[PDB]
Ligand binder design. Sequence first.
Ligand code: VX4
Ligand code: ZN
Ligand code: ZN
Ligand code: ZN
Length: 572
Amino acid sequence: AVGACVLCNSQTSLRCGACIRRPFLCCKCCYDHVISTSHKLVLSVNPYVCNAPGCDVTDVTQLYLGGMSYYCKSHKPPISFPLCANGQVFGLYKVTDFNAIATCDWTNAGDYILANTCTERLKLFAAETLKATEETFKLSYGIATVREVLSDRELHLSWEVGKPRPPLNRNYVFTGYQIGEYTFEKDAVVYRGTTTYKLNVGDYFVLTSHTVMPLSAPTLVPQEHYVRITGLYPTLNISDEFSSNVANYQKVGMQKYSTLQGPPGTGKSHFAIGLALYYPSARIVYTACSHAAVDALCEKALKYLPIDKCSRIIPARARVECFDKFKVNSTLEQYVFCTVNALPETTADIVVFDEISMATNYDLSVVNARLRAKHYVYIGDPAQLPAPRTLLTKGTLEPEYFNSVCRLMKTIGPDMFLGTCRRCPAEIVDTVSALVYDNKLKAHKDKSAQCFKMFYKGVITHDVSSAINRPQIGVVREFLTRNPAWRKAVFISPYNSQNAVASKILGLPTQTVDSSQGSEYDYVIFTQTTETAHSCNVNRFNVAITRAKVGILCIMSDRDLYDKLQFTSLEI
Ligand SMILES: C[C@H]1CCCN(C(=O)c2cscn2)CC1
Ligand SMILES: [Zn+2]
Ligand SMILES: [Zn+2]
Ligand SMILES: [Zn+2]
């Protein structure tokens, strides 16, 4: 009932009752909030409501104090002070940006821009309000009842009438009834159970709606610069493999936190694991939002770090199969690999937060709350894909607004930059270097002469809103017959429905651009499918073409991105 103001920290008994997160607001800030917004309900020990029997006056601007009680203009006694006077709301211990965060629906890009350009306390308020709004929105979709079970991976579904149907992709995870977590892909629908269960008819699936806990810690702790490496002890015997990062490792020990921008295949995992070899006594917690990113760090650690000092932290409510080679849930091992939502309450000499473009400010703050560290290292690339913003429908979210770390990397620049791409053929490196890296990314490999582009719009059909381009898949099939080395290629597109069609017609393994992030393949076949803002996003385009080690075939819809591809053009 009593606490600190989310705008100026001033102690108060006031909480805004119309805010979904009921933030503590001081007399001055509470007034400036209620007078400028539709939010008029204020809560101290008791709510600011008219104490007269049967009276429904809840608006703090229409209320007064009659001794110790509160009454409206129609019930107040002769000796009564208006609650809203002289720029203040009466209570105990006697903002334009806060108003917009407190009242927005989170469907505009300007909402996310503000949630990142505001003060540190408003970034936490915005991140809590957003996540709570995203969860209360999950209650809007319809329930799925099972109609017929055809196979162990296919079924028919009956949807709730009157309530919209959720997009059927891997992003939407349903909880079935407790029969385990389940996912769906497109009359026949493909089912994937986290737990293997004999799918019963009539059984129902509902999207998992979880409680949003409040944020305490900042997204970024206050920066500290040191004259010497602090609390870390370097080797003198450091392997030549990691010699290239020694200056950067020293920078890591001379700052409270550091940012590393690593374009595709420039050495992010190598840098992250090498930091352990450079400070061999240091306890390092390796974290990321996804299980795939945490597993990719375990893969690199398995190669260089001692297996007995590693532990993979796996939450008991296991949703996907993850890294099985380290001792599980041994929180006290020198090297702890764990997703952000599973982090324990612990300390560390270094915390490495990988795939930073995927993190939200909610995740940035959670890490600072669970982990007390001497040093924090943020590794990622603001030119890669951010976390999906399910509520955002109007406007495009620029990289400087993905989270606080990404904002710093795009404004003041990253502290460290891995400038040499060792994965991609030079055609790909030169294309993305000009596109998203200001011509600062360099190619280690030569031009492979196996990078092709085809300008082919085809025909766009739609599975609900997920797009399909059968003529683009037909062009791929003709190319495959003439280029049999490409049999081993991974098929990539911005749409899961395009991928489902390509899987049946081509038989190639499939991946969306968003699920391909962090992975690499010898050959990639990419069909743009449409000319939407989604398929034309330069960050998605960057991730798509940088998956290839040897060759890439790009069947393009957009003239702009097609012309920017420094690939050999093909006819038909
Ligand atoms: C270079 C100098 C100024 C700009 C970046 N900065 C922050 O924005 C920040 C970190 S934690 C809170 N604020 C602090 C460090
Ligand atoms: Zn205040
Ligand atoms: Zn409010
Ligand atoms: Zn009244």
